[PDB]
Design a protein around this ligand. Sequence first.
Ligand SMILES: Cc1cc2nc3c(=O)[nH]c(=O)nc-3n(C[C@H](O)[C@H](O)[C@H](O)COP(=O)(O)OP(=O)(O)OC[C@H]3O[C@@H](n4cnc5c(N)ncnc54)[C@H](O)[C@@H]3O)c2cc1C
Ligand SMILES: Cc1cc2nc3c(=O)[nH]c(=O)nc-3n(C[C@H](O)[C@H](O)[C@H](O)COP(=O)(O)OP(=O)(O)OC[C@H]3O[C@@H](n4cnc5c(N)ncnc54)[C@H](O)[C@@H]3O)c2cc1C
Ligand SMILES: Cc1cc2nc3c(=O)[nH]c(=O)nc-3n(C[C@H](O)[C@H](O)[C@H](O)COP(=O)(O)OP(=O)(O)OC[C@H]3O[C@@H](n4cnc5c(N)ncnc54)[C@H](O)[C@@H]3O)c2cc1C
Ligand SMILES: Cc1cc2nc3c(=O)[nH]c(=O)nc-3n(C[C@H](O)[C@H](O)[C@H](O)COP(=O)(O)OP(=O)(O)OC[C@H]3O[C@@H](n4cnc5c(N)ncnc54)[C@H](O)[C@@H]3O)c2cc1C
Lengths: 387, 386, 386, 387
Amino acid sequence: LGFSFEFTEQQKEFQATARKFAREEIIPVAAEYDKTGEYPVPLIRRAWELGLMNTHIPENCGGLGLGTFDACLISEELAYGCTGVQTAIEGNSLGQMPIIIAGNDQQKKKYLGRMTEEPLMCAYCVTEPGAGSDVAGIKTKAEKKGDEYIINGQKMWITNGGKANWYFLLARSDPDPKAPANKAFTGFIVEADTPGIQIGRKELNMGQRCSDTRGIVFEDVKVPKENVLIGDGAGFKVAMGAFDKTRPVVAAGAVGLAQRALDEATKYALERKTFGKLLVEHQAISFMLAEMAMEVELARMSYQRAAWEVDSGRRNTYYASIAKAFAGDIANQLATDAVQILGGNGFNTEYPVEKLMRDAKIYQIYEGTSQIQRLIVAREHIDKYKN
Amino acid sequence: LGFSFEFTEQQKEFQATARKFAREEIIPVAAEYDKTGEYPVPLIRRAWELGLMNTHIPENCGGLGLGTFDACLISEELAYGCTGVQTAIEGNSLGQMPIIIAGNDQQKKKYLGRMTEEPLMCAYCVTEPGAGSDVAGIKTKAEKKGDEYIINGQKMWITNGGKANWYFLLARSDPDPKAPANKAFTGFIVEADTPGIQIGRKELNMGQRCSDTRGIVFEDVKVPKENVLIGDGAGFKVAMGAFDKTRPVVAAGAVGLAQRALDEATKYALERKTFGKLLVEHQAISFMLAEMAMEVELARMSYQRAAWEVDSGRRNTYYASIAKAFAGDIANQLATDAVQILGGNGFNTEYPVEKLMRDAKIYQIYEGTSQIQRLIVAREHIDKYK
Amino acid sequence: LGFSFEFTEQQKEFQATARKFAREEIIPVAAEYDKTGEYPVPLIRRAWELGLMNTHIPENCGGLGLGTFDACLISEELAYGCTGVQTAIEGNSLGQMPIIIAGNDQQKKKYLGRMTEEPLMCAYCVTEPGAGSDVAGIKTKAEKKGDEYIINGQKMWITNGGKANWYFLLARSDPDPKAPANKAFTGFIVEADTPGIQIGRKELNMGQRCSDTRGIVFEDVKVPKENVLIGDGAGFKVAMGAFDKTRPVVAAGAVGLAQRALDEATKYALERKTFGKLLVEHQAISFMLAEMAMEVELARMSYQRAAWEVDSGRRNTYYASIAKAFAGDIANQLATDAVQILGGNGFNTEYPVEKLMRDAKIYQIYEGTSQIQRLIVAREHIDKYK
Amino acid sequence: LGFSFEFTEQQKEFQATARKFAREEIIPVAAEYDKTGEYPVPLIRRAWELGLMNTHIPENCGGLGLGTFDACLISEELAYGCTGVQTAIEGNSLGQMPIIIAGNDQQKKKYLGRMTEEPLMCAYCVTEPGAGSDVAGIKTKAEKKGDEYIINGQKMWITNGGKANWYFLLARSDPDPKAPANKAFTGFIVEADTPGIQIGRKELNMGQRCSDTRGIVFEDVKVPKENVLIGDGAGFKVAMGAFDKTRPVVAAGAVGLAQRALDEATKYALERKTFGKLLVEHQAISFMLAEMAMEVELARMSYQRAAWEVDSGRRNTYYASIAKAFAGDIANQLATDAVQILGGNGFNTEYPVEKLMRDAKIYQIYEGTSQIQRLIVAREHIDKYKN
Ligand SMILES: Cc1cc2nc3c(=O)[nH]c(=O)nc-3n(C[C@H](O)[C@H](O)[C@H](O)COP(=O)(O)OP(=O)(O)OC[C@H]3O[C@@H](n4cnc5c(N)ncnc54)[C@H](O)[C@@H]3O)c2cc1C
Ligand SMILES: Cc1cc2nc3c(=O)[nH]c(=O)nc-3n(C[C@H](O)[C@H](O)[C@H](O)COP(=O)(O)OP(=O)(O)OC[C@H]3O[C@@H](n4cnc5c(N)ncnc54)[C@H](O)[C@@H]3O)c2cc1C
Ligand SMILES: Cc1cc2nc3c(=O)[nH]c(=O)nc-3n(C[C@H](O)[C@H](O)[C@H](O)COP(=O)(O)OP(=O)(O)OC[C@H]3O[C@@H](n4cnc5c(N)ncnc54)[C@H](O)[C@@H]3O)c2cc1C
Ligand SMILES: Cc1cc2nc3c(=O)[nH]c(=O)nc-3n(C[C@H](O)[C@H](O)[C@H](O)COP(=O)(O)OP(=O)(O)OC[C@H]3O[C@@H](n4cnc5c(N)ncnc54)[C@H](O)[C@@H]3O)c2cc1C
């Protein structure tokens, strides 16, 4: 067999559909959605109709049953158009992943099945105002009371928080402070219409402005025991396990934004003249473009490797964290270099690059910060070492 | 003789006044001005009343007669509060500089003197839609017709463009395409109320949102010959010469923003706990803060050196471009590191750091981009060896 | 089909053979060869015996007929042991490549066939004292005189220069100064025993000290017309074309050195204690190692991509230059970080890391400098937009 | 009062003497000393005769009584010639500093006075095979036995280790493992001819090859109580205090090396032509040179600031560690950039730049590693914000 860097024919078809959608539908309206902060309902509904959403849902639940490699290639194309739109769409896959990997047949048919019938959204609730990077520090409480659990806590920065039909929620189920992380938490599926759920205001962030991000308070929220993933205490492994499939998709989003910044900068450098030459003819500008192209290519291969590893049935933690760390860093470098190449125009809102700079910063923060990715890569590298 | 890194007592007093003003008056309202994009008239008027504006105006024009070193120390304090507010105030010094260095007695008394009597603004017009870095590429035309020049052209990105009482304007006066840059341009003082001037829209930029930045159109604008700086063809040297005094001030602005980012990140890192420890206790975070402190200290000394050089009566081109290049780069690095240290909160508009990231990017672009600063440093550096 | 990051079974067997050879035979003697600068004849002979040399030689010439991907995986394992030894071995592939890609059957059987029978070395001569990066600037002359060419010129920095059985030589064949690069040069195969070939001293470089690097002068050297690759004027395309297959192999060498630096630093960090903890327990050290691991992994995939592209029958210029630029940079960053992690011991010659720092620098210079790789990437990138 | 970046007339005279010596005497022989590793006795003796060595010794001990600023300006000029030669000379100041700052009149007259009479060397012994960065981890024992201390332990990497007339030595005097660092150690002046001191082989390092660096064993070495600096347990503060005056001098050494790399690269770039132009005309090369010039200028001001701080009577820990961290980093960047600009010639030993790359690495390691400098700067910075 051997190495191959060629997509299958089906993958080329998915890529073509996602690219056409991003170019014809997302790009022409993304600046307006970023200005208004309006949730991009028409684009989400069109992505759903084109089969570009909920791609991991198994075929037996009415889904496409695609793998992580397929989700990444779609995600890169959507992100090229807008990561605000792509984050809303990807948010569904983040909420669904714990059910896909740890749900029983009933939970999958009920909660994933509904997503294949209508363009509903879902969300995942882990982060709290007091703890984000430190998942083992979460304080939202889950207490078993007969055939149900009572949830009390506050979650923060929830993507699709105000639009979700249901949430994946991680809560502390063991009151013992000495309980190890792998036994202390429970993962739940929570219907959004449950009494006691209080959704907060839309948060106003620097970037991905059309994505919906909110705080949510859970006050004595009743959850049936049938909505527990695996069982009491299995929450940490379910939530951590879901990153193997989602982290390469997030890295692909950063790559799409980076590719957009590179394309905008190159096209501008081929039109703008200074000192009697096109910008591409000034060696400092050509060297920047060369370095930007090197970074995009290497970041793309990093997510492709992480996606192929998990699709091959292997744990991909090391590769997925390398991809998230590297793609997150280079999306930020490319976005500021693209603003730089456009000069005064680059700093201006009528040009498309300043939005990319505002959007890119989230890739060093959400879904495991740059520092957390380094902590993971360090642990995996040190564990792999042998004389 | 001998090195010294201690301010004079008068300089400590100016620093204290500017610091108190930035911390008590600018900081509490800067987020609201960034949200609305409203021109910060009350703050500008208060800075003017406190003697923090137009500092280079000579004492014989009713000014304070301070030097570049004094302007920088004030600029750093104001920028710490908000670079949108500081850029509006600094814009006056950018417009005034060609008059201070090249104006005759009448031009200085008339145009600088009025600034000491009322909190008027001024602006400088060099950049055009077609040329910014390439000053020798400007196409705004100045045609001599008797005792006046007729100006035709469009200028772009002018700080205080819609608020200025008058402009410094650079225009091409030699129609011959083979005319060298040192003979082809003429610098003018142009009153903003002159018929034929059309002030454009407020440009909506990523950062420094409360600063007024506008395109300005000149259609058959009549300028008296008495408003020419030095003479026909001296424009390029006047405009280039003005950077010696303004470039260290722009670098000081970047330093103030960088110091603000460092302070916000350090204070947050002493309050936020993760994995059972304050962020400062995680070595990666302490190393980040140490590197950020190193960069701010070095960038501050870079502008101090460039300012002292010009105040000492030496050309400071090499030091001023090192300061602008380095301070511009580190303000950007520090602003993104401060957003990083605050995490999710850092990305949010209720915290002060994302504004710093949006504001910082202009320091790599305006008043000579990062690339242009490197071209200047290389030329000055290489000149020492040949 | 679809993507795959799994080697073939045959590739896993080659990797195992090369790894065992590097770890058991190269590593224990590499420090001694670096100290003496002795040409590593016993290791070269063992690599030849094991089938780890001249891997691109076609099966019809008695060779293994392996592709670029196979050559890269072997190169990475050898380089991990020592890039001085790996450069001597790789030097054979550099000299053979123009014959592999552009030789006729006679040239291939004669010159490649002899390499499969005995562990002979060969070399490639392009660089001159006056031109290295600028291949179109070469001045070595080739004058056609009946059925032979007369070569006159000086070549510089030739790997295996004093050990080669034959050379690939690029010379200017068109004396017209207006002749374009694609018509001005001719590529030749030159027997090393030809009268007129004068070998210089062994150059003493900072790193890869056991590799043989020498200047070579050709004084009225007679080369038969049957030794011309393709024909008069085809030299530039032959020499440029050879980089498609060799550049990923050079990048793989840089990755091997980088992997060795990472492994030596990690082993040390798992043994050395400071402040009551192993070095790995200090977050700054663990962050370092994480970044070093990220860089090695990405650099490895970059050469694997470039090697697969050319093996699949596509021009790989863009991917090959990305790989050489990135792997060359990271080998240098990793080697200095490894010296850093070992502290005082790292700076000392009894530890293995200072040799890695000295060896790594060549990867930013030979086989197309870091700057030249960026010029190539820029040209290939921009070409996609028109 | 008011800032000034102008040297005094006396400082311009010292600079001129040191520059003439480095350019006429050090530069022409530095490559030979680097090749042979021979200790540069003729250059050290000439530096001593010119008044360029032991500059901090007070005038009442027969010394020049110069400050840290004066020592830095001299150090930069010598380092430009060769940091191997400059480290041997600076080694004297490292050994003398604890006596200058903490010695009593008798100790200063005896140990410093002898250095003003003959070009003797001295050295400082803190580092051990088991601990370098972690000074509080040193295990060399000093057992008080009446009127003397018995020393047992091994020191490693001692500059001028085999050439010293006497050593400053730091040893653990409190056997209690719970003793805090500020009470556990004692600093001594130890005559090199004391029975029980065994000097190891010359260590062969990558760079500064002509500098003498050795391991030293102290086996039942008797040190009189009159040779104790301050008293029992004051060792840690004496050793740490000495860095305030020595750290800016080490940073000045890195700056001299960096300035040499920049000069060699610029001169070459003005002569070498490629693709029809001088290297300076290729924008990537001019941008490199501009960035190298920026770094050298900033690193020079960082040590000048740290030196002025201590000379003005202030603790300069924060500025000195910024200078050592920054100058150490930029000497390494400039040396590799100078090798790069020279191309194949740069990698070759007949050109002067590869020696600079090998020499530069020590500036990130000795006299407090890059990491240790960051730990110091972090502590100094962060503590200012605690209320
Ligand atoms: C727009 C947006 C959308 C998001 N979407 C979701 C979502 O849908 N669901 C959800 O559950 N969460 C979501 N999050 C939360 C996100 O995952 C967190 O912001 C992130 O994990 C960081 O946590 P934090 O903000 O609490 O920062 P903190 O954990 O407080 O960290 C602050 C800083 O310290 C660093 N740091 C922390 N611990 C260490 C350490 N041990 N060593 C070194 N450095 C350290 C971090 O890297 C960071 O730079 C989102 C966040 C944003 C802003
Ligand atoms: C908010 C704002 C306020 C400003 N205020 C003023 C003001 O008050 N008055 C005024 O006159 N102007 C002002 N300017 C204009 C500013 O000076 C220009 O934006 C700047 O000089 C860059 O010119 P440009 O935008 O035309 O970019 P360009 O000159 O088009 O350059 C585009 C890019 O190419 C690079 N580049 C250009 N030439 C070269 C070269 N030879 N080699 C290598 N790289 C090169 C640049 O560095 C940049 O990255 C302001 C700009 C902004 C955005
Ligand atoms: C140990 C060793 C082994 C080698 N082996 C071989 C071999 O076997 N055969 C052989 O033919 N050659 C070989 N070489 C030569 C090698 O390829 C050259 O050293 C290299 O191509 C650079 O050429 P140069 O040294 O002439 O540097 P130059 O071309 O003089 O370049 C000097 C510097 O300027 C930069 N530069 C040059 N032109 C530009 C430009 N247009 N824009 C921007 N930057 C530019 C370069 O990147 C470099 O940093 C070897 C070299 C070494 C040191
Ligand atoms: C040529 C030479 C001359 C010298 N001259 C002298 C001399 O005259 N006298 C003398 O006493 N010593 C001298 N030294 C010793 C020098 O000071 C030490 O090498 C240096 O202090 C580092 O200590 P170490 O080598 O034990 O490294 P270690 O302390 O083992 O550290 C190894 C690595 O880990 C890092 N590290 C260590 N602790 C931490 C931490 N807490 N957090 C993060 N990173 C950490 C270090 O920065 C380094 O990268 C010299 C060294 C050399 C090589």
